[PDB]
Paper text:
As typical for GH32 family enzymes, the BT1760 comprises an N-terminal five-bladed β-propeller catalytic domain and a tightly packed C-terminal β-sandwich module linked to it through a short helix.
The 508 aa-construct of endo-levanase BT1760 with C-terminal Hisx6-tag crystallized readily and yielded large (shortest dimension ~100 μm) rod-shaped crystals. Thus, the formed crystal actually comprises pairs of endo-levanase monomers that are linked by two closely situated Zn2+ coordination spheres, even though the asymmetric unit contains only one protein chain. In addition to the genetically removed signal peptide, the model is missing 14 residues from the N-terminus and 2 C-terminal His residues of the Hisx6-tag due to crystal disorder. Crystal structure of the wild-type BT1760 revealed a MES [2-(N-morpholino)ethanesulfonic acid] molecule in the catalytic centre with the morpholine ring of the ligand pointing towards the bottom of the active site. The morpholine ring was coordinated by two water molecules and the carbonyl oxygen of Thr104 while the ethanesulfonic acid ‘tail’ of MES was stabilized by side chains of Gln239 and Arg244.
Residue numbers in the entry: 15 to 506
Write the structure that this text describes.
C-alpha cells in the first residue's frame, strides 16, 4: 500500500543463505558425504569480536541441495593459546573407504610465532560419523621441510584420483613466489612431496584452491588474496597438465574473456563439491560495517558473513558461469502482485511492459523478506545502461543499484542518489540481441543477481527486504517486460 522507506532488519532470520545463530560464516569447506549422500559444509566460525589467539573453530552445516541447512555445531575446536592450531584456518575434507574415516586437514595458525616456529602448519582430525572429531596429535606438515614457506602454508585441498592416489594441494610460497604445492599419499597418513602443482600468477596469492574434473575439462577454482581483486576466479585445461600450464612461467592462459572472474567482491572463498548430478560452489557474502551498504571496505571488505551456494554451469567451450541451485529457486512459491507505485522521467507504460528513456525510473511495490524477482530488459543499443535498484522508497535520498553497463561489458554495484558512488563490478558477456533475462534471489540482506546464465553477482543489501525496488535507465532506452515476484512465506 505504501512505498516509503521502512527500517527493516535481519533479526527475522535467514534461510537459504545461511548464518549461525551466533556469529558469521567464514571460509567454507564443502564435501559430498558418500555415505550420508548429502553435502557437509564445514566452515570457519567467526565472531564479532574474536578472542585473542584462539579463534575460527570449524563448525558445520549439512544440506542435500544448497537451500535447506541443518546446523551441526562445533566440530573441530581451536587448540590452546600456545598450540600450533590456536587459530584454525581453511582446509578440506575427504572420506577414506579403507578405514571408513572422514579426514579433515586444516591450517594451524600459531599465536605470535618465534623465528624458529612456523606461523602455519597443516594438521588433521578424523571422525567415523562426522559428529565426533579426534585431532591427530602427531601430524604436523611443515612447508619448509619440503622447501616451501614457514609462515604461508595453508588451505589444504584433498582429492583422490581414479588410480586411487590421494592428493593434497597447499597454498604456499617458494622463495617468496606463490606456489600451490602438491603432496601424495596412498592412505592419507604418510605423505610425499610431488613438488609444485602450479605457480600463482605474478605476485598474486591463490587462497582456497579447489581442483576437479567436470565433463572433459579440469579446473582450478581459487580466491584471489590481492586486495584489488578479492574475487573467486578459475583456470581450465583439457588435461591436468594443460591446467597446470595456464600459469607456468606466468603464461596467463585465462579460461575466458574475463580472467575467469566468476563473481565479484561480495562472494569469497568459494569451493565446490559434486553429488554426481550438479557441482555447487559455496562461499561467503561479507557483512558491512554499520550495516551500511555503501561501506565496502577501504582496502578489503569485512571478513565472513552469510553462506551462499551457487551452481556451476559448464558451457560447450568449457567455460564456467554460476547459476542458482534449483532447490533455492524452488523455495519461492508464493506469487505476489506486482504494481507500479511511482514513475519518474521520460517513460511510457504499455500494459505490463514499460519503456524507460534516460533518467526515467519506475518504483514497484514493497518486497517481502525472502524474494525471487524476475523480469526481462531489452535495450535499444549495445551501449545502453540500466539499473536494478533496491531499498528505494519514494522518500529515499539514496538507494543501491546494480548498474548493467552494456558499453563497458560489466555490471556494477553502486550507491545511487545522494552521495552516489561506484563500489565494485562484475564483467560478463553482453547479449548480442540486447535481451537481459534477469533473476534475483534474496534472503533478507543477501541476494544474488543472475542474467542470461552469464552474470552471477552476489551482493549485501541491508534492508532490501520489506522495501520497494525499482528499474531505471541511465543511458539509451530500455523496455521492461514480464515482471514477477514470488516469496518464501505464504499468506492467505
Ligand atoms: Cl517472504
Ligand atoms: Cl510461511
Ligand atoms: Zn522468513
Amino acid at each position: 500500500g505504501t512505498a516509503t522507506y521502512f527500517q527493516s532488519s535481519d533479526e527475522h532470520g535467514f534461510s537459504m543463505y545461511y548464518k549461525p545463530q551466533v556469529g558469521f560464516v567464514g571460509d567454507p569447506m564443502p564435501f559430498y558425504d558418500p555415505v550420508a549422500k548429502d553435502f557437509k559444509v564445514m566452515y570457519l566460525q567467526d565472531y564479532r569480536p574474536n578472542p585473542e589467539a584462539t579463534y575460527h573453530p570449524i563448525f558445520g552445516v549439512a544440506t542435500k541441495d544448497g537451500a535447506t541447512y541443518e546446523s551441526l555445531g562445533e566440530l573441530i575446536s581451536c587448540g590452546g593459546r600456545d598450540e600450533q592450531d590456536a587459530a584454525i584456518g581453511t582446509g578440506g575434507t575427504i572420506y577414506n573407504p579403507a578405514d571408513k574415516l572422514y579426514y579433515t586437514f586444516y591450517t594451524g595458525n600459531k599465536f605470535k610465532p618465534s623465528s624458529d616456529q612456523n606461523a602455519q602448519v597443516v594438521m588433521v582430525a578424523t571422525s567415523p560419523d562426522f559428529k565426533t572429531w579426534t585431532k591427530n596429535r602427531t601430524f604436523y606438515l611443515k612447508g619448509d621441510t619440503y622447501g616451501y614457506d614457514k609462515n604461508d602454508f595453508r588451505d589444504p585441498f584433498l582429492f583422490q584420483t581414479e588410480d586411487g592416489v590421494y592428493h593434497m594441494l597447499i597454498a604456499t610460497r617458494k622463495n617468496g613466489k606463490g606456489h600451490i604445492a602438491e603432496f601424495t599419499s596412498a592412505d592419507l597418513k604418510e605423505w610425499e612431496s610431488a613438488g609444485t602443482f602450479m605457480t600463482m600468477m605474478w605476485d598474486r596469492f591463490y587462497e582456497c584452491p579447489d581442483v576437479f574434473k567436470m565433463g572433459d575439462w579440469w579446473y582450478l577454482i581459487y580466491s584471489e588474496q590481492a586486495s584489488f581483486m578479492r574475487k573467486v576466479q578459475y583456470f581450465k585445461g583439457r588435461t591436468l597438465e594443460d591446467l597446470k600450464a595456464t600459469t607456468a612461467n606466468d603464461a596467463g592462459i585465462w579460461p575466458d574473456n574475463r580472467e575467469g572472474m566468476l563473481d565479484s567482491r561480495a562472494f569469497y572463498a568459494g569451493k565446490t563439491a559434486s553429488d554426481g548430478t550438479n557441482r555447487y560452489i559455496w562461499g561467503w557474502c561479507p557483512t558491512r560495517a554499520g550495516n551500511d551498504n555503501g561501506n565496502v571496505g577501504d582496502v578489503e571488505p569485512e571478513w565472513a558473513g552469510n553462506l551462499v551456494a551457487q551452481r556451476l554451469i559448464q558451457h560447450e567451450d568449457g567455460t564456467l558461469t554460476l547459476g542458482v541451485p534449483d532447490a533455492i529457486d524452488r523455495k519461492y512459491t508464493s506469487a505476489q502482485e506486482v504494481k507500479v507505485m511511482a514513475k519518474d522521467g521520460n517513460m511510457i507504460e504499455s500494459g505490463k511492459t514499460y519503456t524507460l528513456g534516460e533518467g526515467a525510473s519506475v518504483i514497484f511495490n514493497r518486497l517481502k523478506v525472502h524474494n525471487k524477482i524476475s523480469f526481462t530488459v531489452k535495450t535499444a543499443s549495445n551501449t545502453d545502461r540500466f539499473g536494478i535498484s533496491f531499498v528505494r522508497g519514494t522518500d529515499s535520498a539514496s538507494w543501491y543499484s546494480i548498474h548493467v553497463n552494456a558499453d563497458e561489458g560489466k555490471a556494477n554495484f553502486e550507491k545511487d542518489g545522494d552521495d552516489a558512488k561506484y563500489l565494485f563490478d562484475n564483467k560478463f558477456n553482453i547479449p548480442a540481441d540486447n535481451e537481459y533475462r534477469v533473476t534475483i534471489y534474496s534472503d533478507q540482506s543477501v541476494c544474488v543477481t543472475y542474467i542470461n546464465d552469464q552474470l552471477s553477482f552476489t551482493n549485501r543489501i541491508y534492508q532490501m527486504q520489506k522495501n520497494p525496488w525499482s528499474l531505471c535507465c541511465y543511458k539509451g532506452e530500455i523496455t521492461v517486460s514480464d515482471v514477477q515476484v514470488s516469496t518464501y512465506h505464504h499468506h492467505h
